[PDB]
Design a protein around this ligand. Sequence first.
Ligand code: CYC
Ligand code: CYC
Ligand code: CYC
Ligand code: CYC
Ligand code: CYC
Ligand code: CYC
Ligand code: CYC
Ligand code: CYC
Ligand code: CYC
Ligand code: CYC
Lengths: 161, 161, 161, 160, 160, 67, 641, 36
Amino acid sequence: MQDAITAVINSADVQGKYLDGAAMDKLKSYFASGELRVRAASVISANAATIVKEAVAKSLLYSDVTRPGGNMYTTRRYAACIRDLDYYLRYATYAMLAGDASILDERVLNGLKETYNSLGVPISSTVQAIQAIKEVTASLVGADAGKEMGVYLDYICSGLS
Amino acid sequence: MQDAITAVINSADVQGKYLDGAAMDKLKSYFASGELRVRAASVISANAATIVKEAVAKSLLYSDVTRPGGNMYTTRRYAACIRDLDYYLRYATYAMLAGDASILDERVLNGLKETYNSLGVPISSTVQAIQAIKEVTASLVGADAGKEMGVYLDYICSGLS
Amino acid sequence: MQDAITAVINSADVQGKYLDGAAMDKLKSYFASGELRVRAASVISANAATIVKEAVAKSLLYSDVTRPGGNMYTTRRYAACIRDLDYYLRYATYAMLAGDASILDERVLNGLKETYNSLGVPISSTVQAIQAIKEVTASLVGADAGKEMGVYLDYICSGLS
Amino acid sequence: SVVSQVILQADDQLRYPTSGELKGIQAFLTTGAQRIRIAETLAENEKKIVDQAQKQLFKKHPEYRAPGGNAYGQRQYNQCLRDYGWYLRLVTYGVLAGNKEPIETTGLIGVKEMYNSLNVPVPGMVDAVTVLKDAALGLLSAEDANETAPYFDYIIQFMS
Amino acid sequence: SIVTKSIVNADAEARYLSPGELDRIKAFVTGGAARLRIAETLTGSRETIVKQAGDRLFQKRPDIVSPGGNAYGEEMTATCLRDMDYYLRLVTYGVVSGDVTPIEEIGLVGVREMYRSLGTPIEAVAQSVREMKEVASGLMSSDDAAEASAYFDFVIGKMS
Amino acid sequence: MRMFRITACVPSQTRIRTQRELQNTYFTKLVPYDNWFREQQRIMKMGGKIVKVELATGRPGTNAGLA
Amino acid sequence: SVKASGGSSLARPQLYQTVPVSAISQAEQQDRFLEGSELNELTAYFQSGALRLEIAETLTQNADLIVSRAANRIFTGGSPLSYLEPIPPGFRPINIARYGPSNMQKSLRDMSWFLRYTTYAIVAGDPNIIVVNTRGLKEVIENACSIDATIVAIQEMRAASADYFRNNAQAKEIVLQYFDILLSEFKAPTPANKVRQGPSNDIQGLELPQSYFNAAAKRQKYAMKPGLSALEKNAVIKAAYRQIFERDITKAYSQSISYLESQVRNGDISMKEFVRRLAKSPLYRKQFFEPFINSRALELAFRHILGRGPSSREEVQKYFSIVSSGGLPALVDALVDSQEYADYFGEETVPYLRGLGVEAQECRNWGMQQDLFSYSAPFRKVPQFITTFAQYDRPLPDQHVYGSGNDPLEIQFGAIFPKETRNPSKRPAPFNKDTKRILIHRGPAVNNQVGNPSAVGEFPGSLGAKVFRLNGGLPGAGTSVKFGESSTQALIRAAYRQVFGRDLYEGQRLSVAEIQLENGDISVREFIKRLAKSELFLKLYWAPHYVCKAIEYMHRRLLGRPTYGRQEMNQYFDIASKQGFYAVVEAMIDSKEYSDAFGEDTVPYERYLTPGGLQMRSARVGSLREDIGQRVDKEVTPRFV
Amino acid sequence: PSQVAFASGDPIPQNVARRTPGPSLNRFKEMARQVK
Ligand SMILES: *[C@@H](C)[C@H]1/C(=C/c2[nH]c(/C=C3N=C(/C=C4\NC(=O)C(CC)=C4C)C(C)=C\3CCC(=O)O)c(CCC(=O)O)c2C)NC(=O)[C@@H]1C
Ligand SMILES: *[C@@H](C)[C@H]1/C(=C/c2[nH]c(/C=C3N=C(/C=C4\NC(=O)C(CC)=C4C)C(C)=C\3CCC(=O)O)c(CCC(=O)O)c2C)NC(=O)[C@@H]1C
Ligand SMILES: *[C@H](C)[C@H]1/C(=C/c2[nH]c(/C=C3N=C(/C=C4\NC(=O)C(CC)=C4C)C(C)=C\3CCC(=O)O)c(CCC(=O)O)c2C)NC(=O)[C@@H]1C
Ligand SMILES: *[C@H](C)[C@H]1/C(=C/c2[nH]c(/C=C3N=C(/C=C4\NC(=O)C(CC)=C4C)C(C)=C\3CCC(=O)O)c(CCC(=O)O)c2C)NC(=O)[C@@H]1C
Ligand SMILES: *[C@H](C)[C@H]1/C(=C/c2[nH]c(/C=C3N=C(/C=C4\NC(=O)C(CC)=C4C)C(C)=C\3CCC(=O)O)c(CCC(=O)O)c2C)NC(=O)[C@@H]1C
Ligand SMILES: *[C@H](C)[C@H]1/C(=C/c2[nH]c(/C=C3N=C(/C=C4\NC(=O)C(CC)=C4C)C(C)=C\3CCC(=O)O)c(CCC(=O)O)c2C)NC(=O)[C@@H]1C
Ligand SMILES: *[C@H](C)[C@H]1/C(=C/c2[nH]c(/C=C3N=C(/C=C4\NC(=O)C(CC)=C4C)C(C)=C\3CCC(=O)O)c(CCC(=O)O)c2C)NC(=O)[C@@H]1C
Ligand SMILES: *[C@H](C)[C@H]1/C(=C/c2[nH]c(/C=C3N=C(/C=C4\NC(=O)C(CC)=C4C)C(C)=C\3CCC(=O)O)c(CCC(=O)O)c2C)NC(=O)[C@@H]1C
Ligand SMILES: *[C@H](C)[C@H]1/C(=C/c2[nH]c(/C=C3N=C(/C=C4\NC(=O)C(CC)=C4C)C(C)=C\3CCC(=O)O)c(CCC(=O)O)c2C)NC(=O)[C@@H]1C
Ligand SMILES: *[C@H](C)[C@H]1/C(=C/c2[nH]c(/C=C3N=C(/C=C4\NC(=O)C(CC)=C4C)C(C)=C\3CCC(=O)O)c(CCC(=O)O)c2C)NC(=O)[C@@H]1C
């Protein structure tokens, strides 16, 4: 991946110059927000499975998606969808702790959209499940870290769409 | 791959014909210039690293390519680029010895252009570096072998572009 | 592997001495016998199938070895045995060309007994078949070249005992 | 930075980072003020640091500027000064990041390959980095010098 | 050819041709004249070689030209002589190339399943090549005959 | 057995330090469904860029008759 | 100390390349006879050999003068030749007095060494030795040796050496080319080491100097590409079969999977996918999965797919879990999809055995990987990596000091040892001279002589073996029906069963010894000594065995116990070296412990067992006691009854 | 034809010199130079 700190360092390096105060303010801001990010990551880690179950119940269960004819029908495909959501939550947590969306563009949105198109996995339903994940984690973590995690979940959502 | 002699063998085979005069004389011509090929390949091998050094010196260095923002900036990029040039010189030597450019197409120019485009390696400056290699080797091995090697170096360049 | 030149050079070098008279004597003997050894190797390569056929006919066929309960009985075991005979011929040729039995030590006699004792291949029958191969090759290449190949075939045979 | 290292280690095992990794992240994210001031102090003093380092090196290796030497000629000399400055910039990058990754990805991997192709001796480069280390640490407080020395040591260790 | 094989092995080890390989190819290029002379001798009298070898084959294997035989009749005998001419042409290709690469690529790779699908006894084809080798050896000098016999015997071995 | 046809570029990240020979890194291939998740994760963890993926073998939304 | 050994076999890295080795290895790595290419190289090299030896002769004869010219051009202010063991701008002559005697010696030695290795390279027909030992010498000697000075010395040596070859452009060109290679390689900067990073946290990272790689035999690498000729694709597929199946089973047995080969040569599947599907195939299943327990199968699979053996305890643990869960497909998928596989072989390259010379090697799996890479690996069934890795982490095993093969079966009769080559099972462990093997007494545990040294000779009663003693009087010490005939004969036959394991066939008994014992002329000890020294004992138990196997079996029969360690073993083995079989028997039966345990009237008997022997006897279903190694629940009638 | 004999030919014994005290005995060598 590619952190916010390393993002500032990379912009400086590509310019070939030292890190000016204008770019050093971004570094200071990221340094300040360490405690919130680490706490949010710990909270999410302690409750990942519960988050996924709650989001699935909110967004997917008792719908045509999970009835016969829906991609979430059958046991194996249900488990595959749950695994996808687990990976999404973990990678969103990674990007939140990093302060950058590069890991999402690198290890999530890399051939995933076209894989889903090939398999006919409904993009809208997946985005809905990610929105439910966002709501559950925000309700579990807080407003500030909730929004700053919803940014990265939204990055994933807009990449899939 | 195929050599210049396998080339004429194949040309005759497609017609089911024995080797006639127009094929025998081409085999004679290849066997007449083979000694120069052996000598030129020996010289190039004896000075491959220096050839690549001199080619890079008068083509890429002290340019925006090696400046920050240029695709040769950073030690890893520079090392990779010179390694690519080493490979190009060696493969052009192979084709020179064989008298044919089939090896270039089958073991150099297959996914190379796609790989560079995915990576962002500048094709134009790659071509310029290879042209500098052509100049250096021509000055090192003599006009005849120099031209007969620049043929294959240009083949690589045209394949990349 | 090591050839005769490597053996002589290492003997000279471990003592820090230039190539002396005895070393030069052995090296020039190697170089003088080289052309006829190459010719013998070419002849053997051109007749490997016939050599193995005749050796098998002389030594193995129409015996307890090829009948039910014999180690060569089934078709798979027969094919494996003639393949092993081809191995022995090829590596004897390697040893002859190299002018040293090191290839036989590191590529053949390493775990030859492991393999054959584990599979229960009859050692005496193998030695008889290799002696037949030596006799057939001698009849085909000549008495002196036959002796040159026979030293190495006997080396494998004694390794089997 | 250490955050990226933690995330890489966690993803390689397909798990959330453990408690210890997050605690290390917290400690690093707290020492940021010292890292930032070290980076700034080294930044504005690039010229003096490079001047001391280069005079020391070319006192150590007069051959480099001597005829037939790699640095002989104003162009080559200026490129060497450019290299001093660039590696000092890399050191500041590493100090800010909290690890050697910005240094290593930019100016250590393939560095021998590059300088061999330019006939700049790698031992010349390690001596250069040593003198640059001495000069730069001379311009820092004791604690800041202790903090920023291991980055110079890492460049030195990689160089040879 | 020899050049192709040497280059392929060099590629397999990702290295320039060694001085020994440059020497083997030097010898190959020098012997090009003799091998071309042999190829010219073979191609000049291809018709006589084919005719005599086919007649000798029919003498030695009467069943092939009998009812229930693959070559039975005028047309099938004509195609059998055509195959003999094909293989002599491939032998000339091998002679000029100094290697059996053309012969393997054109005539021998998957030859057993080719003739098995036609109901042709492969041993008889090997015998026909043997007769062609005999006639060709009778048609030129012994020193040239050995070099031609190497490739003839390669064809025979890949058919026996 | 469903198969994905995938086109991807996966440059080596260790070539300079290992000095191992250059290899073609841009490839199109068929990967079985059962390994495509691991393969995709591996490629993206390499720094690779997946260019195109299609369902070469199989049909979308099939419940029975996979192998 | 270390608690286990993976074995140690002779390692022969290539020091440098020569033309015959190059050609013969080129043919041999492809499993074929030398063809026109390699044979032609050999012919040309052999033809040039006479000239090459002429060059070497002239240079060795005049090496003194060439080195002297170099030393005179390079040094100033004295005579460099007082003790023998184009111009760079910075060159300046070096002062002998200032430069120092040690460094002057190294200068002269290096010049002579350069000329010597140049002659070596001339004879070998390859400059590889020069490149190997000269690329990076500069940086090795910059700080104590002038590079300009060395360059000028080499140029002077080159000129002087070529001066002897006005013959024609045959000798001169070769000398000049080899000296030019030497010059350009001495001028070369040191290349970076090849780094083999650990694929995970349980495997260490390593690096190898590039000179080591340059010397070693180069591994031929096969890569499937769409544009290759058909013959090249055939060679690549054959290489894939040789790698995965350890030999060309298509050539040997016509075994092949045709559709997989068509797919891979078309580019439908990559070489990686081809490897995955081939290793899952019933051919591979039958050859390298069905014959083996999973523990050995995974080691073979690591050989076939990654070109290396397991690297650590954690790795074998992880992959044995994988094969336990999902069997062969799971194992193959995990190996092929590993980051390590893609790091080395990618999508196109056929996997290759890495091993010594190709990259930096680890000490921890050295011997095991040596064994694994042998073509005899399929015939080792006992796992070698899990066993050795586990034994690293644990104390020394219960095992003979010289290895597991030196432990015979603890059966009634027969000297049965594992054969080193038959189903290889060797388990070397480092027992130093002072270890003592823990033995299990056949009798009351507290009578073990370790804890109770005065218990020696205490008969074990019902807990141990039957003991035969000549306690009763001997007959005739006339009348018939003298009862002292049955006991003495029972003791004689017991002694035969003790020394030989079982009774002899008719005509084999030492009748003279028997009558001489029955007449009170000798003691029981003397009679068993005669039995042990008998030619029959020699033929049966001494002659057919490794010396130390014979000694160990002897010790078990005569002292009723295995040897404790290296002290007893070494003394008997040394006697075997010096005196021979009869003296070894004498030493065993005249030893103090024999006297203590057995007097002049007691037939020896089994007094101790190894843990392995006792487990063999007492761990079978019909002999295993109910209370051993399990919870014994007391059964009580239910309270409601 | 008989020239082919190298391994089957008459062996050519090579000179291998008996090893002698190396420089690690230098001090004792000096002592040996001062013991007469
Ligand atoms: C008529 C059937 C064809 C024919 C046969 C033929 N075979 C041989 C010799 C051998 N045949 C075998 C075959 C097998 N042994 C096995 O164990 C198995 C599987 C059970 C098979 C199929 C073997 C091993 C031999 C070697 C002889 C031996 O027993 O040691 C011959 C003799 C060939 C010769 O020249 O010696 C013959 C004649 N031949 C034809 O032409 C018919 C089409
Ligand atoms: C005829 C020679 C005798 C005979 C042979 C026989 N061998 C096997 C099986 C194998 N032989 C080998 C040997 C080698 N493989 C190598 O790579 C080399 C080094 C150059 C050697 C020497 C091996 C490894 C095997 C098994 C695996 C393989 O196929 O490669 C068999 C089959 C045994 C079986 O029971 O399956 C046989 C029959 N048998 C005789 O009776 C002849 C005297
Ligand atoms: C009854 C024996 C036990 C039980 C059942 C139970 N299940 C759910 C909810 C779901 N069950 C499934 C399972 C399947 N759907 C399929 O298509 C198939 C494949 C043929 C299976 C096996 C699913 C997907 C759901 C989610 C809802 C949905 O299908 O839309 C519930 C309610 C869940 C909840 O808590 O809201 C229950 C009660 N519960 C028990 O305690 C019994 C042991
Ligand atoms: C769940 C919210 C939705 C859903 C999911 C679903 N996905 C698949 C199959 C796959 N999903 C992936 C995705 C990824 N691979 C990665 O490496 C990552 C990056 C972190 C992701 C997100 C892949 C590659 C596959 C195919 C390979 C495999 O499944 O192992 C399925 C099953 C499809 C099928 O036909 O079996 C399902 C059900 N489906 C829905 O309807 C939800 C909206
Ligand atoms: C100075 C301490 C030493 C020295 C230096 C020297 N360097 C060059 C030329 C180049 N140096 C670089 C370096 C880098 N590129 C990168 O990406 C990185 C990481 C950020 C580094 C450090 C490059 C690319 C060049 C060539 C590019 C160009 O020409 O612009 C020279 C000149 C060499 C010449 O002219 O051939 C010199 C002299 N020399 C010494 O003696 C010191 C040890
Ligand atoms: C040098 C003149 C220019 C340059 C080069 C450059 N290339 C890369 C990366 C790669 N180049 C290759 C090369 C090949 N692939 C093939 O199949 C063959 C055919 C024989 C060749 C020559 C590959 C495979 C890579 C990827 C890395 C790997 O080794 O696997 C880079 C690095 C790009 C990056 O982002 O790291 C560079 C710098 N760049 C220039 O600007 C020069 C004009
Ligand atoms: C025969 C009627 C015609 C013909 C055939 C022909 N095909 C090829 C090459 C290939 N054929 C295939 C097809 C398959 N491979 C498979 O595994 C399967 C799936 C079960 C199929 C259907 C493939 C993949 C190839 C390419 C790789 C390979 O050669 O195996 C050739 C050779 C082409 C060449 O240029 O070498 C030929 C001759 N050709 C005709 O003219 C007939 C009309
Ligand atoms: C259970 C009744 C007893 C017991 C078992 C136990 N086993 C292990 C570890 C291993 N067991 C195996 C077994 C096999 N390998 C094979 O190939 C097969 C043939 C199908 C078998 C059964 C192996 C290989 C291991 C090692 C696994 C690893 O690498 O970790 C343990 C754990 C040992 C350890 O140190 O982790 C245990 C506990 N133990 C008892 O006490 C029971 C009597
Ligand atoms: C007879 C039905 C079969 C047979 C037998 C046979 N056995 C041997 C050799 C030995 N037998 C033993 C057996 C034992 N030792 C013990 O301690 C026990 C329990 C008391 C037993 C059963 C041993 C150890 C040997 C080897 C030592 C010795 O023979 O004294 C042979 C001779 C083998 C040889 O040449 O060494 C034979 C022939 N053979 C058959 O074919 C029958 C099916
Ligand atoms: C006691 C805490 C536990 C226990 C012990 C127990 N041990 C045995 C038997 C033996 N103990 C040993 C041990 C050693 N011998 C040595 O030389 C050394 C090295 C100094 C040691 C540690 C041996 C070898 C034996 C076998 C008999 C012999 O002494 O020669 C027993 C008896 C087992 C039986 O079935 O008779 C017991 C009970 N048992 C427990 O439950 C305790 C936890």
